[PDB]
Amino acid sequence: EGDMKIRKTDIPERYQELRAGITDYGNMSSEDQELERNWIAEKISVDKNFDANYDLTEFKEAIGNAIKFITKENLEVPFIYAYRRNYISSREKDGFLLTEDDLWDIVSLDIEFHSLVNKKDYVQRFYAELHIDDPIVTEYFKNQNSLQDIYDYLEFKYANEINEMFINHTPLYQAVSDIGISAEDVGENISSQHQIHPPVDHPSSKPVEVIESITKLAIDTVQKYYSLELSKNTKIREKVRSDFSKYYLADVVLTAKGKKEIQKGSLYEDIKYAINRTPMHFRRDPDVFLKMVEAESLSVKLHMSSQAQYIEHLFQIALETTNTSDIAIEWNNFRKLAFNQAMDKIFQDISQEVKDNLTKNCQKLVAKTVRHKFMTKLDQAPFIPNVRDPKIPKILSLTCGQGRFGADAIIAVYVNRKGDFIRDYKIVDNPFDKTNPEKFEDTLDNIIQSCQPNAIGINGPNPKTQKFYKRLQEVLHKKQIVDSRGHTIPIIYVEDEVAIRYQNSERAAQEFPNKPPLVKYCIALARYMHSPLLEYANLTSEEVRSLSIHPHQNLLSSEQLSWALETAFVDIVNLVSVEVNKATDNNYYASALKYISGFGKRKAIDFLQSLQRLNEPLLARQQLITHNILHKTIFMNSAGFLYISWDQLDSTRIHPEDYHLATKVAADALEYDPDTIAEKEEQGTMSEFIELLREDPDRRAKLESLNLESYAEELEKNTGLRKLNNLNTIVLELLDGFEELRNDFHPLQGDEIFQSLTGESEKTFFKGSIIPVRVERFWHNDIICTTNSEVECVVNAQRHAGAQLRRPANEIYEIGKTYPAKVIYIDYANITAEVSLLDHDVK
């Protein structure tokens, strides 16, 4: 029972899921909070690339503002970006703005900072429990990844003392002493680089002798445990750390099978022997590193700029017998060996640390690009035909299946404006039937007259789908089926990456128990044209993670991928909004609910359930509180993303807290006297101004004439609020509540069509590539052939070395043989390319 705690708690669901591993989230010290504002500010300034002169004060203040909004006020990114833009951007035009990417970044870093503080507090509380006064560690929590090292140090040095802390809650060493310098002192030596503790040599006895006072099975052990003790010193490890994380390089080493895979043909023809690099190179191309990691499942070695020399150099700074006696020499050899063993070990650890941390760093860049690639998918407004009369289209979606025009039949589905499946069709007439061709025409026609669709969508497995498409246009023209404008109804290819997932899905078997796969496939296509957002939003987790979004996406950890996707969803889902009433009555449509700011997978259910008990439709937004449905904050996060189609302002992107402001702009737009306005205002009848502005036939001209720059200034000058952006989106909404703000729908065009039906990667069949082509039909002089991927390629009558030796081209080449040739024009739209077979273009 953790779900009741989430359903009840008045906090955004996503925040509860993030802070789940964080003890005492609220109570944080002052200092820690102070450091966090500055630390996050750093993590962002980077990508902003500011001038060395640039004064960061206003920028860091904006970061502070963002952190207040997230961590104390529990507002989510969408709310901050929609209704608080002026508190996270620079006052002066074009200074800085925290983009939405940035705000999600800030969320992540905050959680991360709290975790760190938890670990720090945990260790420091752990140390107080050892009632031991260790000078190293006490200095540590005064003066200042490193946490793990001190902790490891306590578990080593005070082992017994801790072994006893737990029970409570639930002579060889002389030789070490004879070395003339303690492990701790070496640490303190390095922080000064001068060597304030010179080692003292043994007074008389040699190394070997102090041993005899009790063979090689006893000299090894001492050296091993002294090596061990030396490698745990925090000061030393600290030194090596960081000097390594900046002055390191990358060495890639091939393996047994790693030398066969390459062959200069794979995409590693430029990292197969990469040696000696820098953090910059991977700053520039962070994918490069991940590639390596895929290839390895070669390997990846991180070396230092000069390791052999650095270690050698360490002796010049510390452990250095200036004395010329034999004894010092002997003692010194022991020390050098012990030291090298220890230092190798340290390097083996820090290499691994810096590698781990570089890996995570590249993963971070890739999560980002993945989120945008996916976001551009989500950010497609419903396809609208002609554009001159925005109207949601009735859809007829067709598929040519495997494309056997005399065996697979043509499948058609009809979907209406509301998105409803009305019926399906099985056209059995062969479109390219010799006698008669018209049979397949009148039936396609009948179906179009019975349905009157406004758009046609198609797609299929192979290039036969093309032939189908050409045909459909010829039928649309021969039969003269136009719109309102008189233009032939548009046919568009429709991204089908989701339809593929729906036809073989449980969600499909339940929705349509007795329709066949290809029908489920076309119903999808239609549904995609109506709302690409909702298609993605209706896949299962498995299904959403299985889309091919970015080639390097499989390089992310599940957590990172889950994150990239979810934030993209929240962004577009709140941009478009949700009709309460429409979600509470349509489960497909209520699928977008779980991503609205404040809500999650669990809150969405509970919310819909509250609405169903009401047994009547929701009227004003305000009723969300009166009826005891949402609490203060969850109501604040979600108020302006939940609308009621049509208190008239509940159908705009204007947030409730700004209503009283909205009515104030209307009164001034119309130029009402201040006496009249104040009068209505005392009464509490300001809303009336909205009606008066709605009636006025000149309404647009009066809004557009308000100077928002002048206006926001006066507002702030009187109330201490920054609402410029707010007023701006208000006026836009008063002109027209909830306009479509997604980018246009993007129908597959040329290269994408090609890439769809052919399945040929753009990096696999490109302009100027050599592709083996199998002659097929000849021509007076042109040679028609095909490739191995079902693409019809025409070799020009003048590109096959026919007119170079005169005489027909038939006699030269063999029907069906294969010949290497270089492609030269590709007609992506018509799945064909003109290719040249000349020796000069094959060499």
| Architecture field, domain 22-170 | Orthogonal Bundle (1.10)
Please, which residues have CB within 8 angstroms of residue 332's CB and are 6 or more apart in sequence?
Answer: 319, 321
DSSP assignment letter at 323: -
Contacts of 560 (CB under 8 A, 6+ apart): 363, 364, 366, 367
Is it true that domain 1-21+577-646 has CATH number 1.10.150.850? yes
Q: Report the DSSP beta bridge partners of residue 456.
A: 396, 491
Q: How far apart are CA 601 and CA 595, in angstroms?
A: 8
- Which of 107, 97, 102 is CA-nearest to residue 75? 107
Residue 701: how many other CB atoms lie within 10 Å: 10
C-alpha 60/C-alpha 40 separation (Å) is 9
| Cα–Cα distance, 267 to 620 (Å, whole number) | 58
Distance CA(823)–CA(703), nearest Å, equals 58
In angstroms, rounded to a whole number, what is the distance separating the alpha carbons of residues 597 and 637?
A: 6
Helices (H), 479-586: 499-503, 506-511, 517-530, 532-537, 541-545, 558-576, 580-583
- Phi, psi at residue 9, to the nearest 5°? -45, 135
Contact 560, 549 (CB under 8 A): no
Report which secondary-structure segment, H or E, holds 41: helix 30-48
Q: Measured between alpha carbons, how far is 65 from 55 in angstroms, rounded to an integer?
A: 17
Q: Which residues of 394-426 are buried (b: 16+ CB within 10 A; e: fewer)?
A: bbbbbbbbebebeeebbbbbbbeeebebeebbe
Which amino acid appears at position 630 of this protein?
L
**Pick from 330, 311, 349, 319: nearest CA to 219:** 330
Give the whole-angstrom CA distance, residue 244 versus residue 350.
8
Measured CA to CA, the distance from residue 235 to residue 184 in angstroms comes to: 8
- Please report the DSSP string for 47-79 in residue order: HH---SS---HHHHHHHHHHHHHHHTS---HHH
> Which amino acid is it at 271?
I
Cα gap 752→466, rounded to integer Å:
13
The pair of three-digit structure tokens given for residue 143, joined into one six-digit string:
């003066």
Q: Any idea how long the chain is? A: 843
Rg of the chain over Cα atoms, rounded to whole angstroms, equals 36
Q: Are 638 and 593 within 8 A, CB to CB?
A: no
Q: Can you tell me the distance from the alpha carbon of 826 to that of 758, in angstroms, rounded to the nearest whole number? A: 13
| Cα angle: 804, vertex 806, 807; to 5 degrees | 140
Please give the CATH superfamily to which domain 647-743 belongs: Spt6, Death-like domain (1.10.10.2740)
CB–CB of 459/496 below 8 Å?
Answer: yes
- Please answer whether residues 211 and 219 qualify as being in contact, where contact means their C-beta atoms are separated by less than 8 angstroms: yes
Q: What is the DSSP letter of 253?
A: E
Residue type present at position 795: V
Report how far residue 58's alpha carbon sits from residue 63's, in angstroms, rounded to the nearest whole number: 9
The CA distance from 504 to 520, in Å, is 8
Both structure tokens of 228: 């061990």
- Rounded CA-CA distance 151/126 in Å is 9
Instruction: Give CA–CA dist 482/360, Å, rounded.
Output: 56
Helices (H), 670-811: 674-683, 688-695, 699-703, 708-719, 724-735, 750-757
CB 60 within 8 A of CB 38: yes
Burial track 95-127 (b if 16+ CB lie within 10 A, e otherwise): ebebebbbbbbbbbbbbebbebbbeeeebeeeb
Collapse the DSSP code of 442 into the 3-class scheme (helix H, G, I; strand E, B; otherwise coil) and give the result.
helix
Surface-to-core class of residue 18, CB atoms within 10 Å of its CB (0-12 exposed, 13-18 middle, 19+ buried)? middle
For residues 6 and 602, is the Cβ–Cβ distance under 8 A?
A: yes
Copy the structure tokens of residue 720.
């201490």
Burial pattern 340-352, b for ≥16 Cβ within 10 A else e, equals ebbbeebbebbbe
| Residue 760 contacts residue 813 (beta carbons within 8 Å) | no
* CA dihedral for 281, 286, 289, 292, sign (positive or negative): negative
User: How far apart, in whole angstroms, are the C-alpha atoms of residue 700 and residue 331?
Assistant: 92
8 A C-beta contact, residue 769 and residue 761: no
The answer to whether 419 and 435 are in contact (CB under 8 A) is: no
Q: State the Cα–Cα distance between residues 651 and 654, nearest whole angstrom.
A: 8
In terms of Cβ atoms closer than 10 Å to its own Cβ (0-12, 13-18, 19+), residue 824 is middle
Residue 533: name the closest of 570, 486, 583 by CA: 570
Whole-angstrom Cα distance, residue 680 to residue 685? 5
Alpha-carbon span 604 to 606, nearest angstrom? 6
CA distance 606 to 594: 11
End-to-end CA distance of the chain: 71
Burial class of 809 by CB neighbour count within 10 A (0 to 12, 13 to 18, 19+): buried
How many Cβ atoms are within 10 Å of 672's Cβ, its own excluded?
15
What count of Cα atoms within 13 Å lies in the side-chain half-sphere of residue 567? 24
CATH 2.40.50.140 for domain 744-843, yes or no, is: yes
Residue type, 819: Y
Q: Which fold has domain 388-531?
A: Nucleotidyltransferase; domain 5 (3.30.420)
- Please answer whether residues 19 and 25 qualify as being in contact, where contact means their C-beta atoms are separated by less than 8 angstroms: yes
Asked whether the domain spanning 647-743 has the same topology as the one spanning 22-170, the reply is yes
SS (HEC) of 339-369: HHHHHHHHHHHHHHHHHHHHHHHHHHHHHHH
Contact of 378 with 547, CB cutoff 8 Å: no
Find, among 144, 14, 100, the residue nearest to 571 by Cα.
100
3-state secondary structure of 620: coil
| Nearest residue to 143 via CA among 208, 267, 234, 20 | 234
Elucidated via: X-ray
Give the separation between CA 202 and CA 334, rounded to whole angstroms.
12
The rounded distance, in Å, linking the Cα atoms of 424 and 366 is 42
Do the beta carbons of residue 110 and residue 118 sit within 8 Å? no
Cα dist from 585 to 97, 502, 612, whole Å: 40, 22, 9
Q: DSSP alpha helices (H): ranges in 379-463?
A: 438-451
Domain boundaries, the chain: 1-21+577-646, 22-170, 171-387+532-576, 388-531, 647-743, 744-843
Alpha-helical runs (H) found in 556-641: 558-576, 580-583, 587-590, 601-614, 623-626, 632-638
Half-sphere exposure of 564 (CA within 13 A, CB side): 27
CA–CA dist 221, 365 (Å, integer) = 47
Q: Report the amino acid identity of residue 47.
A: D
- Would strands 818-827 and 832-836 be described as parallel, antiparallel, or unpaired? antiparallel
Beta strand 491-493 with 578-579: parallel, antiparallel or unpaired? unpaired
Q: Is the peptide bond before 436 cis (omega within 30 degrees of 0)?
A: yes
Domain 171-387+532-576: CATH class, spelled out: mainly alpha
Cα dihedral sign for 129, 131, 137, 143?
positive
Cα 560 to Cα 105, 108, 190, 555, 566: the distances in Å are: 12, 11, 39, 10, 10
d(CA 248, CA 242) in angstroms, rounded, equals 10
Complete edge-to-edge strand list for the sheet that includes strand 491-493? 421-427, 410-415, 395-399, 455-458, 491-493
